Amino acid sequence: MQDAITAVINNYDVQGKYLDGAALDKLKAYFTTGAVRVRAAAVISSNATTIIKEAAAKALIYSDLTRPGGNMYTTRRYAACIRDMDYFLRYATYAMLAGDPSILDERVLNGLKETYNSLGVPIAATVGGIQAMKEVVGGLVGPDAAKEASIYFDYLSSGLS
Amino acid sequence: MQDAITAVINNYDVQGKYLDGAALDKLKAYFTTGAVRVRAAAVISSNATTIIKEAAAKALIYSDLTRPGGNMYTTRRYAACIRDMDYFLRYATYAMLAGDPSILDERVLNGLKETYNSLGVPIAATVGGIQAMKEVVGGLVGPDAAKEASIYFDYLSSGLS
Amino acid sequence: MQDAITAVINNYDVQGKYLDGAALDKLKAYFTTGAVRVRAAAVISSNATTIIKEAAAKALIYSDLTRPGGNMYTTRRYAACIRDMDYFLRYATYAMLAGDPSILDERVLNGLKETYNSLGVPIAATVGGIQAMKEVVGGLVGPDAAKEASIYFDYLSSGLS
Amino acid sequence: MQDAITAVINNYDVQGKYLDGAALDKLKAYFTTGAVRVRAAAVISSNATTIIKEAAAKALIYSDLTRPGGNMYTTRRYAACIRDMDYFLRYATYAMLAGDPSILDERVLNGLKETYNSLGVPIAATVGGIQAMKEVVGGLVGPDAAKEASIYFDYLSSGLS
Amino acid sequence: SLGSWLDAARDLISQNDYSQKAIEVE
Amino acid sequence: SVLTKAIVNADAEARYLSPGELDRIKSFVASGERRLRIAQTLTEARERIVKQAGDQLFQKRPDVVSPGGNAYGEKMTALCLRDLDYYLRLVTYGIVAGDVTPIEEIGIIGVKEMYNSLQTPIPAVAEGVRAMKNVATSLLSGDDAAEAGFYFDYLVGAMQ
Amino acid sequence: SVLTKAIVNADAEARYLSPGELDRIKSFVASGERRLRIAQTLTEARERIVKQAGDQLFQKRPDVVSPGGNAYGEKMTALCLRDLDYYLRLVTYGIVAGDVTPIEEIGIIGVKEMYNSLQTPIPAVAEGVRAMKNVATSLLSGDDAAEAGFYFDYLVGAMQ
Amino acid sequence: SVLTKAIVNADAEARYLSPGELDRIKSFVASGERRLRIAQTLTEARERIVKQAGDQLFQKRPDVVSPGGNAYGEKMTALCLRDLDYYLRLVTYGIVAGDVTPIEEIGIIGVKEMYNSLQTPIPAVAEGVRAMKNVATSLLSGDDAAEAGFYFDYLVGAM
Amino acid sequence: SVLTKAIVNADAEARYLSPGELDRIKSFVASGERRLRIAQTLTEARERIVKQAGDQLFQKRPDVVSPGGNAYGEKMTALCLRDLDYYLRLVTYGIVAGDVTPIEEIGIIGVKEMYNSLQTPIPAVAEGVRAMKNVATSLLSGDDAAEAGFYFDYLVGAMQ
Amino acid sequence: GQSVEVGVGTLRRQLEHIYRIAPDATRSEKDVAINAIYRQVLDVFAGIPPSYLRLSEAESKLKNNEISVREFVRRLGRSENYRKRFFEPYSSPKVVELLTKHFLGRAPISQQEISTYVQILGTKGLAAAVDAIVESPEYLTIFNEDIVPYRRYPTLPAGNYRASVRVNDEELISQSWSSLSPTYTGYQYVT
Amino acid sequence: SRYFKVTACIPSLKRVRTGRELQNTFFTKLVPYENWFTEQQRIQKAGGKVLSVKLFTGVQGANTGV
């Protein structure tokens, strides 16, 4: 994976360049954002269970998916779905701290689409659930944090679709 | 795997329907057949080695395949072929008890043709060996049992080809 | 492990004796008892959680053990104690079905005292908890069943002490 | 393992006592020492290879051990001995940061005597090597650090003997 | 003994009755 | 099912089916006709069983049907009944299968996790199943009721 | 035995015994009285069964009782009969247990290796067991004979 | 603690402490005096925190302290308060350690099992901890309060 | 970086970031501004640091700059200085990252094997890095120098 | 020009933790290692086993230090949850691939390796195949008795680095273990 | 099933390992009976010594229940 700080460093290392003021400005930008991100991450971790419940209520449950024949029908499948939701939330939080989406590409997004297609998990509904989590998270974290949080959720959704 | 009983249940569960008289009739049909199947299975298990020997004599041995340049030439390959025959017999017996072909699809049939093609195993000869086993089994089990036994052997043969 | 039926066979096989009338009488005795045992086992399984709760209330909780400085202080230790209680109950039920105490020796009793001594688990309290479970079980199972049930609980208690 | 801070906490938890001023004073004592310990640890890590070389020169090499028929004779045994020396140094450094000897008991000391006896490794010589390392370390770290460092080296030596 | 809890708990029960509030969704 | 379980164990051992395993299959096929009748009885009386069980549950636990409780409101109360109906359907499938395997995969694995997200109390759910057993037992013959009881008991045990 | 097997499966799953597993135990204990009678019959007729089976086996395989063959000579022929008696005793134990587990430990594991050292042909031994079954079946009632047959068949399957 | 965690990672990788690991130790030991102060404040006000949070909890959940409810009766009510006191003590330990290792071993691992046997409702124990946070936070300076808050939140998360 | 390391530990534990781990991140972001200044100072003085450190190293070990030695000859001497420059660049990256992860991936993994092929003596390389630290320390403020020292020391530790 | 995360990359290293259980170790340390066992051998991506998957008696013997991590891993494979999730749905050649992945950390090295294990599965148990890999010399060199298995992407034999990337990084499990209640294709969108 | 309790000490004579290998070197453990013969051989080939063997579970000379 890569984080914001390392991403700058890596770009300079391929050039072979020592760090310069322009590079330092990007690093400085991250350092101001950082405090906000830490606070946001703690909020999400404490309210994680609630976030998933609310998001499921908004998109997944009370639907044909939960009703017989649906992918989220049966307790085993319901539990699997909320398990996946929790994974996505945890990785989004990691990405937000890191300030880079790379981690999402590596662990979360690798082979996911193909696996989902074979399983018969509906991608569109999953995307919907990610978007629902984002909205819920946005409220909890507060507006400044929400903008940062949103991009990582959006990154996941675009990958899946 | 899924057995006959579970196959009925599954069909009703996806509909969400409670079990109904028509469904019950299919279940009832299986229960009459059941006793015959158990007797047949014990016959096959006791005569398993003989069945394979007779079937090999009918199709595989005294042939070009066994002679040098053939796929069942060398002790290693001969032994592999009789091992495969034993597997087919064992799984067909399992399917006959179950009253469902599913187990054959899940373990025996899945990826077999592709494996055989890479190995260079001749499918036609294998099919011939399965058909030979069926005839031998038919004699041992007796007529009522034979009809039930035959369909699973036929299912294997069709899958391979 | 060993059950009543196998124990008889065990004894005759070392002698090399064919099964005899006296042996048959022991087997016959087990077969009459069997129906009672099966009923008792189902009762215990359904009420298992309650049995453990009642027994803990009787002996373990509201005590110095649960208070700080006691072996059942901390959630981790409390949970371990009720897990052990569950084990004893489950194995006693298995023994009662089997009609043999061997299984208790083979899986529960062997090495338990030494383990407990190193851990600092108090044996006397454990014994007390087993005896409490027995009393609760006795009520649920009913008198005929209770006599059979009691011996296995007593066997555990004697082993521990 | 346990550290100084956790050791105080654990002692109060068994009593069930909330943290008190006397306890706080012990914790405060560790916090003043801490800065010095971190500096010492960095010194040791940078000079680790040198420390081992000097200590071996002082005690192990140019001796009967290195000469044929000695435990440190053969390249394989020489290499194993300097590997063990490195272990002792690394764990003592860990203990010095932690402010607790527990980690030494948990990882280094446990089973060492028995292993050494089966191997035929001479304990007395090993102890001598540890004592030599201590003296070398003392010089590098400086006097204030040395006192703290010494106790962990002494603890290892006493355990081994 | 939880003596401090025992007296404080009864003090709390006497000062206010919980048996009427009813749960509030809030 | 009984059949499935026997075959699966044999496959893992890579052996043909044991004499004892064959005997158990024979017993199951003999019992099958009885089992089908028991299932049919419960299916017919389903609406009544659910309703009676529901009443008992609500009487035993006021809270679930209260503003604080999960069941509160008509929609929520309906869902609680729907759940009870689902569990009854599972039990009938279990009786005909002769095993809890059908029940277990559809309803008991992951049940804790599902209910915890919903925030429904699991012990209450168990009570509802116990209630259903009592009603069901009354409709069934004594011998039939014992058979049916085991499957009901398994559910109650699992939801704990 | 049936009991042992059921408990062992439960212990692996770390669960109390399933309704289906309990039912199998119930059926077996009902069958037990009949099983004991079947075992008694075979025990009484054992000397006759062994003798008749021996004769048929020697008829089926002249070679075994020939100078080259292992069975040749009085002592050797006695040993071959002794072996048949051992297998019959095992079958009786199996019938009362309702499972081949007892039989399997004493007779079927390591059997190939033992016979290979002795140089006795395993297929001939199987034929002798088949012979024993035919004699035993005639003495037994038809229903009883079927039960007994399974255990005899298992032996034949195990060494083949 | 912070120390334990750092050392454990190093030992597993069979290496001396990284510059990063050393830095975290330095930061932690600087914060030590402040952390001890936060713990002391909460220790002193323990009885108040428990009791006021208890009152809020009983208001929030009347049912538990009702004849039907599990917590009903004075003995039962005392136990619920005793539990709150235990959890508060744990929080203070966490703050001084700078990590949850102490908290986790003593109070969260196996917690699901214990309360479920007792039949005490956990979907409410968490609320009690939330309540305690609110009271405790009001006795602390803003910076101190935030530090203390994390540990309270962890508990709520863990249940 | 500090961030990368924290995330990796959390992933292994399969947990959200702990309060303690979050605190470590907070401390790093506060320190960042100071760290950037330290790095800038070293970047400006880089040419001087490399040159002075080279001289000290050559004084410490005449051999490397001798016919036997690897550094001998103009091209070789330049390459040895180039290597010192590479390590200095890595150290600056390390200081801003707050961890040696950047340093370690670019420079310390496989370093033994690389130098062994080249036949360059590793202990001399370590001496050059020590030399660089001494020069760097003089330019830096005492507090700054201590921070910088750790990263320099890590390099020396990693290759010795 | 190429970057530090180009070939093998930085991630797969450092996502690998050697875990050893120590008797002295705190419960919180021990439970992180136990959870790692479950997550490698049963493919628990979330990394915290659901309780029904756990095996408690084995965990207690492991926490007591009566058994080794190696012997715990052997018990898991002989477990029924292993057999239902990994043996029963798959075909034998895929079963072998999953064995090497689950214990051993790598894709099967060769068709000859596949054939030996397939012959074990067919002639003897799943358990006998589980016993063979753990007993194998490869197993004993990389992990011995103390180390919990890890994902290792070898590269020593030819083709193994690719194969082991495909089995550890792209072959997420794509079949359902359970047969019952098959999901209908439609109902994709939620309305 | 029968189980053995076994103590053994094993040296690394082919290579020198940096990670702590004490747990591998001296290992008291419980072994299923069916595994022990292979596990004994393994210790012997490594040039380890088997310090002790006791049968933890199971009865000596039992024809069934083994």
Ligand SMILES: *[C@H](C)[C@H]1/C(=C/c2[nH]c(/C=C3N=C(/C=C4\NC(=O)C(CC)=C4C)C(C)=C\3CCC(=O)O)c(CCC(=O)O)c2C)NC(=O)[C@@H]1C
């Ligand atoms: C929830 C919003 C939706 C949903 C989820 C769902 N997932 C599965 C099954 C699997 N989920 C995964 C996913 C992952 N495995 C990984 O390794 C990663 C990335 C590292 C992810 C995110 C996997 C592989 C499985 C298969 C095996 C398993 O459960 O571990 C199911 C169950 C499918 C089944 O038939 O069992 C479900 C229900 N499905 C929905 O309907 C929601 C829209």
Ligand SMILES: *[C@H](C)[C@H]1/C(=C/c2[nH]c(/C=C3N=C(/C=C4\NC(=O)C(CC)=C4C)C(C)=C\3CCC(=O)O)c(CCC(=O)O)c2C)NC(=O)[C@@H]1C
């Ligand atoms: C002679 C020493 C013994 C003997 C021989 C015998 N063999 C067969 C049949 C076959 N023999 C083989 C063997 C091989 N195939 C190979 O690839 C190799 C290695 C290069 C060997 C040794 C095969 C394949 C057969 C099958 C028939 C065929 O050739 O296609 C028989 C006939 C078997 C039958 O029962 O009909 C016999 C008799 N048997 C003895 O009695 C001697 C001790």
Ligand SMILES: *[C@H](C)[C@H]1/C(=C/c2[nH]c(/C=C3N=C(/C=C4\NC(=O)C(CC)=C4C)C(C)=C\3CCC(=O)O)c(CCC(=O)O)c2C)NC(=O)[C@@H]1C
């Ligand atoms: C015999 C009728 C014919 C024959 C067979 C043959 N098969 C192989 C190799 C394989 N056979 C299989 C098939 C299975 N393995 C299983 O476990 C199952 C399901 C239970 C089946 C049916 C597989 C997977 C292999 C590959 C690995 C292995 O050997 O186990 C060979 C060997 C060919 C080689 O060169 O490796 C042969 C000879 N071939 C014939 O000639 C007959 C017509």
Ligand SMILES: *[C@H](C)[C@H]1/C(=C/c2[nH]c(/C=C3N=C(/C=C4\NC(=O)C(CC)=C4C)C(C)=C\3CCC(=O)O)c(CCC(=O)O)c2C)NC(=O)[C@@H]1C
């Ligand atoms: C000569 C070709 C090079 C050289 C050699 C050198 N060696 C030492 C010191 C020691 N050498 C050994 C080596 C061995 N011990 C063994 O068991 C074996 C295998 C059988 C060997 C090869 C040992 C153990 C020592 C340590 C001292 C001792 O033996 O007690 C030195 C001394 C340097 C010092 O002590 O620091 C030297 C000079 N040195 C060169 O540069 C030559 C190229």
Ligand SMILES: *[C@H](C)[C@H]1/C(=C/c2[nH]c(/C=C3N=C(/C=C4\NC(=O)C(CC)=C4C)C(C)=C\3CCC(=O)O)c(CCC(=O)O)c2C)NC(=O)[C@@H]1C
């Ligand atoms: C050096 C001062 C003395 C010396 C050492 C020596 N040790 C061994 C072999 C082993 N040493 C250990 C010790 C440890 N392993 C650990 O995990 C720990 C705790 C972290 C320790 C301290 C072990 C386990 C071994 C065996 C396998 C291994 O290499 O690790 C030898 C080799 C003996 C042999 O024949 O194998 C030697 C020489 N011996 C001396 O003479 C010095 C005084």
Ligand SMILES: *[C@H](C)[C@H]1/C(=C/c2[nH]c(/C=C3N=C(/C=C4\NC(=O)C(CC)=C4C)C(C)=C\3CCC(=O)O)c(CCC(=O)O)c2C)NC(=O)[C@@H]1C
């Ligand atoms: C009644 C005894 C208790 C109760 C029930 C209750 N359930 C819900 C909501 C749902 N329940 C389910 C459950 C299942 N889905 C399955 O596939 C199975 C197994 C076949 C079950 C049992 C589901 C999926 C839902 C979610 C909504 C949906 O159906 O899509 C509620 C409503 C809670 C909410 O906020 O939605 C309730 C009340 N609650 C109690 O307290 C009773 C004790």
Ligand SMILES: *[C@H](C)[C@H]1/C(=C/c2[nH]c(/C=C3N=C(/C=C4\NC(=O)C(CC)=C4C)C(C)=C\3CCC(=O)O)c(CCC(=O)O)c2C)NC(=O)[C@@H]1C
């Ligand atoms: C209060 C939040 C809830 C409540 C309280 C309540 N607690 C108990 C009993 C116990 N509390 C403990 C728990 C602990 N022991 C420990 O070691 C720790 C970790 C430090 C804790 C948290 C124990 C052991 C008990 C059991 C009995 C005893 O204390 O000896 C009870 C009594 C249980 C009962 O069923 O009678 C009660 C009622 N009840 C609520 O509803 C509140 C939500």
Ligand SMILES: *[C@H](C)[C@H]1/C(=C/c2[nH]c(/C=C3N=C(/C=C4\NC(=O)C(CC)=C4C)C(C)=C\3CCC(=O)O)c(CCC(=O)O)c2C)NC(=O)[C@@H]1C
């Ligand atoms: C050197 C002449 C050129 C070079 C090589 C290079 N290779 C890698 C990475 C790998 N190399 C292999 C290759 C093999 N594995 C095998 O089994 C075989 C056959 C015996 C070969 C030849 C593998 C699999 C890897 C990846 C895994 C590993 O590192 O072990 C790299 C590095 C990529 C990285 O990110 O580390 C390089 C640099 N590249 C050049 O610049 C030279 C032209």
Ligand SMILES: *[C@H](C)[C@H]1/C(=C/c2[nH]c(/C=C3N=C(/C=C4\NC(=O)C(CC)=C4C)C(C)=C\3CCC(=O)O)c(CCC(=O)O)c2C)NC(=O)[C@@H]1C
């Ligand atoms: C409860 C009545 C009493 C009690 C129990 C208690 N036990 C432990 C720890 C262990 N318990 C066992 C015992 C078993 N493990 C098994 O597999 C079986 C047989 C099926 C038994 C009976 C073991 C091995 C342990 C040690 C390791 C482990 O945790 O698994 C403790 C915990 C001690 C600790 O701090 O770990 C406790 C509390 N103690 C009491 O207070 C009651 C009297």
